[PDB]
Amino acid sequence: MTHSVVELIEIESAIIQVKMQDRTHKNAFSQELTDDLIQAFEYIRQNPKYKAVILTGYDNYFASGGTQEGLLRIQQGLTKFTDDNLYSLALDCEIPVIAAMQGHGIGGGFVMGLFADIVILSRESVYTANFMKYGFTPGMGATFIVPKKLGFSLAQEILLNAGSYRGADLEKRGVPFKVLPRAEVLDYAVELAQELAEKPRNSLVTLKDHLVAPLRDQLPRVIEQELMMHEATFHHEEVKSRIKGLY
Amino acid sequence: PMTHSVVELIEIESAIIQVKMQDRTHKNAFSQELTDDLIQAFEYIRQNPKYKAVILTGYDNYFASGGTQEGLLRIQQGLTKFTDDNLYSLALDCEIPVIAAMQGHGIGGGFVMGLFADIVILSRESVYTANFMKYGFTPGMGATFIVPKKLGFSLAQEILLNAGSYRGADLEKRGVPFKVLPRAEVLDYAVELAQELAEKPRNSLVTLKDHLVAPLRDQLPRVIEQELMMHEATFH
Amino acid sequence: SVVELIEIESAIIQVKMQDRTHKNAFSQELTDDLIQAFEYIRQNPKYKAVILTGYDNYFASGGTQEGLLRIQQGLTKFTDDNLYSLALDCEIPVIAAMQGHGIGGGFVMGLFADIVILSRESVYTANFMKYGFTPGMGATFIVPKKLGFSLAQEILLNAGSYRGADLEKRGVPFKVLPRAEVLDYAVELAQELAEKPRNSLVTLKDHLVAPLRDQLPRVIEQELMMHEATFHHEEVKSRIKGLYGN
């Protein structure tokens, strides 16, 4: 991309891999990662030949969510989580996206992956919707997509308590996602993308449009509710203390 | 035996009726004879309120194989069109609880027909697939509604988009809510469960089932009209 | 009093149901004491997490035999003394640490908690239909809501008994532990919850459960409608007389 922290590779004629590789920030949503992700998805939107997208990280990190400075900015009231929308990239994509989460998925980074149509976790990586550890309520559509993908009950615990779970922990709690050794996750994503690429692209886009119509319809109102909750929770001095203390 | 002798009704006791699909020529694909005999079997059940539980099941290694190969080809090549049909929703429309004892493979519309049952039992060794997209077509027969409803939104996306084949053992490891057993144990477990259902007053079974599946019965027609439109949007 | 209130650390409140005579069935005393325990929590804005739990081998045993016979005769209805929604109506997160058996309305009351823990050795059942009547107490809403549509169908229609270990293998999203570990794990989760600001726990829980709170009243009316059709038959009175405690 421009900032070189996203690499696009056309794996086959109809499969595009979006690899996040902001090594300086461990795939946290730095300004560079934020700009390069939006540019990668726009590229995919401008080039309607692909049948599947693989979204993945580097080494041990899938995506680590807001930077410390990003979160402090929202605490200060300078910015809101909706300012740059990275959470809904894979939902807004017209073709199926596979979030190959071979490494850790933290906060916004985990939630961005959960909006993909197929999610794969690594057994030995850590996944957390850790918003509430810092004193504020989950944003980035976490309160809609977590129950939608992992189910109402596990979502309560994940969102209220902001705990960290190994992929193996989630596998044992019964999640519908494929969970694999980290070394196998991207290979499995490629094979699944090859299978998807056996279909006509128009059938994949028509089908996904139908399957995720209710998510696209329902998400704006939840985003407005989460912004309301941020109004009521984010701006407290103790949120600043927790971000600085516990990040 | 129903008219064409490809569905057999067997009273297990008093109050339990087994509907056994056995179109061996077509491996329980939706031939004309199986379509007719299935509709005739569920009409018989509706006319005979002595039953409290139904067990729908196949023969040997086949539960139900969905569209015939000839039928699918004729659609693919424009000789015919996808219609709406009774079959997928027979178990939902039935007044009393239906157990789909899927002791054999459930393919396409065959799988989907089983999923509309109130209780679904799979076989570990069998293959289950919503394979519509392998033919190039978007899924019909209410698949886009009933697969997310029974197997959850996330696994439904994979099943429906990729049209892959899952062994029962694979789905069991993925976390499905259905009992998964060896094939040789599927029908006996279904008869045990039907016996326990038949301990209940029939009016309470029916009253409860009406309430639990009301949202499915209410929402399904709109989804069918949506699936019909997707077929139009993917045929020039 | 058959409920004891124990403070744990600074802000965790344990509600322990201890009606030993009735094995935590909804006796008049348990009913009144539970209602008052949650009113006490409602009036105390110190607490951040509730642990609702039973004693020894019992979490909660559901309607007493006389309680069921009183609805059968049409003297009462399940909606008369609302225990079913106690955890849902509580403004802070509630953990149902079901270290013992959860039977009928006692299981359903527990399922309304934000976090549910089962015990491997214990028995859980929505057993309404065993007595011939349809499930009340919000069970047709909360069972599919917590355990998913498909498993809820089998649980509610068939009124079967499941060990915690059986539910664990069928794939439930709740943590299932040996009985002797259930309460200790709930305490550790409650300590983790107590790390957050109370206003963030309340704000978030209000949002997450708003759909339950909004939708529950319509389903309770529907369940009353079903009880009008099913509860008041002689064979229900025979089954309650003959099958209660099996």
Author numbering:
A (entry chain B): 1 to 247
B (entry chain A): 0 to 235
C (entry chain C): 4 to 249
Provide passages from the article that reported this PDB entry.
These biocatalysts are responsible for the final two steps in β-methyl branch incorporation in this PKS/NRPS pathway. There is a single active site per PksI monomer, with each active site positioned on the periphery of the trimer, ~ 43 Å from one other. Akin to PksH, PksI adopts a characteristic CS fold, with a ββα core, that comprises two approximately perpendicular -sheets surrounded by -helices.
Assays were conducted using WT PksI, along with the point mutants PksI-H230A, PksI-H235A, PksI-K80A, PksI-K232A. Of the four PksI mutants investigated only PksI-H230A was found to be catalytically compromised, with barely detectable activity for 3-methyl glutaconyl-SNAC and significantly impaired activity for 3-methyl glutaconyl-CoA. The active sites of each of these enzymes displays the ground state “closed” conformation as observed in the WT enzyme, with no evidence of significant structural perturbations within the active site. These data thus imply that the observed kinetic effects are not attributable to global or local structural reorganization within the enzyme as a consequence of the amino acid substitutions made. We thus propose a His230 dependent mechanism wherein this residue has a dual function both catalyzing decarboxylation and to act as a proton donor to the decarboxylated intermediate 7 to give the reaction product.
